[PDB]
Amino acid sequence: AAVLQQVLERTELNKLPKSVQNKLEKFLADQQSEIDGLKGRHEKFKVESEQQYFEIEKRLSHSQERLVNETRECQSLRLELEKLNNQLKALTEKNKELEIAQDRNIAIQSQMTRTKEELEAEKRDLIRTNERLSQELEYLT
Amino acid sequence: AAVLQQVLERTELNKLPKSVQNKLEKFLADQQSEIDGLKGRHEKFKVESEQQYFEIEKRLSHSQERLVNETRECQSLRLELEKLNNQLKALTEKNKELEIAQDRNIAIQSQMTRTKEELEAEKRDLIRTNERLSQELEYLT
Amino acid sequence: AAVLQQVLERTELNKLPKSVQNKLEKFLADQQSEIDGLKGRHEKFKVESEQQYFEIEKRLSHSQERLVNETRECQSLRLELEKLNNQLKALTEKNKELEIAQDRNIAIQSQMTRTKEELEAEKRDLIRTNERLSQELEYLT
Amino acid sequence: AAVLQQVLERTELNKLPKSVQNKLEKFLADQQSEIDGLKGRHEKFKVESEQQYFEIEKRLSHSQERLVNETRECQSLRLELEKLNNQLKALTEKNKELEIAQDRNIAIQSQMTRTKEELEAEKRDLIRTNERLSQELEYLT
């Protein structure tokens, strides 16, 4: 990487004292290594900054992914809840209905049981009369 | 801005053919301008990529915020869902038993009615027979 | 760094004593160095406060991340809690019905027992009587 | 505010033409305004980022405070579940004992019922014998 040989032809370099050549070549080299250094860093920086952005783009899209899914999840629960409350209200009303029928049935069966007892009492008395009449007939002939 | 004057002393410089001095001052200036351009371009890129990075950070933090908002809503719905499903299970069981009792009550009432009919037919038959037996007490032989 | 040449014309300047030009250009330099000093110290401060802010931003997001995890844990505990309470309520009512049933079966068992004791008394009386009747018939030998 | 009087002595100043003093003082004042302007612009920036930082610190302190509460809420919820599970185990056991008691009582009532029927069979045989003995005794007496 001798820079003076890019800048000057041999014939020109010959007219330069060696110390002067060295002063120049050292300065040229210093500037050139700064140039190489800058280009090296700049390129590394670009690549790094892009990779950092690429990675947070992925983090974003994943976050957005979770939010869409979570939004759907909520909506499906709400829809599900609406239907459950309609089921509950229906069941509730149906059981109120059955409660009412049950109380009516209890009332009815109790009344029937009384009537049955009265009839059976009547039947007992009729039988008593019946056996009495039979007995009196056998006491004739 | 001839930097060559700082690299070489005035005597050394004056003993250079002017064509050589010019070639050196030109090349030196070229390198310095490239250096200034590299720094300029990098500082431009640096600033722009930073701006873009901070923008997507803002977006990501907003997505996380919305997700908190939605997640909170879902979690309350799930609890609400659990509670209603347990009410639902209970009502269903209460309904099952009530309808079982209803069937038994219906069966019981149909047998009560069947029994009542038989009792009333028996009663009417006893009354007819006793009316007849009474008449027969007064017969002659 | 002789700035003085800008503010004063050629004759005005050359008519200034050496000590005056030296004093003026030194003062101008000192004020320029305060200026450059201010500029460099600001840029230093600027970077430092950005770095400081950048750090707290990450601390904030780390705090929100910790909170998401914590809240998820609390909500799943609350879900188990609801489930657990409803199991308890069921059992509590189930047991209470069993306790009522127990009280009824105990009342039945005591009644059955008095029934049994009544039967045993009747049997003892029957046996005493049949012994007496037997004796009275044997006395007719 | 006369800057020129600070840098130069009265003897040097007297020997300056007035127009020249005015040019110098005007230039010095300009440079001084630049100095003061930078000190003002820094101080402006400084206070602005200072306040911005206080605001992000509030958000951090708030997030942390919320985390503390949630963290504490979770520990207490874990203890509620352990406590309720303890009660649940106790209820389950009581339930198991109740059902076993119910089973014991069914068994007892089945034994009693078998005993009852055997008592009633003995009674009927005793009654048949009694009726036989009475009729024979009624015939002879």
UniProtKB/Swiss-Prot annotation, chains A, B, C, D:
Q: What is the lineage of its organism?
A: Eukaryota, Metazoa, Chordata, Craniata, Vertebrata
Quote the record's domain comment: The N-terminal domain mediates intranuclear attachment to the nuclear pore complex. The C-terminal domain mediates its nuclear import.
Subunit and interaction comment:
Interacts with IFI204 (via C-terminal region). Interacts with IFI203. Homodimer. Part of the nuclear pore complex (NPC). Associates with the XPO1/CRM1-mediated nuclear export complex, the Importin alpha/Importin beta receptor and the dynein 1 complex. Interacts (via C-terminal domain) with the KPNB1; the interaction occurs in a RanGTP-dependent manner. Interacts (via C-terminal regionand phosphorylated form) with MAPK1/ERK2 (via phosphorylated form); the interaction requires dimerization of MAPK1/ERK2 and increases following EGF stimulation.
What family classification does the UniProt entry report for this protein?
A: Belongs to the TPR family.
Q: Which stretches of sequence are listed as region Sufficient for interaction with TPR?
A: 2-12
Q: Which disease is it linked to?
A: A chromosomal aberration involving TPR has been found in papillary thyroid carcinomas (PTCs). Intrachromosomal rearrangement that links the 5'-end of the TPR gene to the protein kinase domain of NTRK1 forms the fusion protein TRK-T1. TRK-T1 is a 55 kDa protein reacting with antibodies against the carboxy terminus of the NTRK1 protein.
Query: Where is the protein found, in the record's own terms?
Result: Nucleus; Nucleus membrane; Nucleus envelope; Nucleus, Nuclear pore complex
Reported tissue expression: Expressed in esophagus, ovary, liver, skin, smooth muscles, cerebrum and fetal cerebellum (at protein level). Highest in testis, lung, thymus, spleen and brain, lower levels in heart, liver and kidney.
Identification of the protein by name: Nucleoprotein TPR
Q: Which residues of the full protein are shown?
A: 2 to 142 of 2363
How this protein is processed and modified after translation, per its record? Phosphorylated. Phosphorylation occurs on serine and threonine residues (comprised in the C-terminal region) by MAPK1/ERK2 and stabilizes the interaction between these two proteins. Proteolytically degraded after poliovirus (PV) infection; degradation is restricted to its unfolded C-terminal tail domain whereas its coiled-coil domain containing NCP- and NUP153-binding domains withstand degradation.
The N-acetylalanine modification is found at 1
Q: What is this protein for, i.e. what is its function? A: Component of the nuclear pore complex (NPC), a complex required for the trafficking across the nuclear envelope. Functions as a scaffolding element in the nuclear phase of the NPC essential for normal nucleocytoplasmic transport of proteins and mRNAs, plays a role in the establishment of nuclear-peripheral chromatin compartmentalization in interphase, and in the mitotic spindle checkpoint signaling during mitosis.
Q: Which gene encodes it?
A: TPR
Name the segments for region: Necessary for interaction with HSF1: 13-116
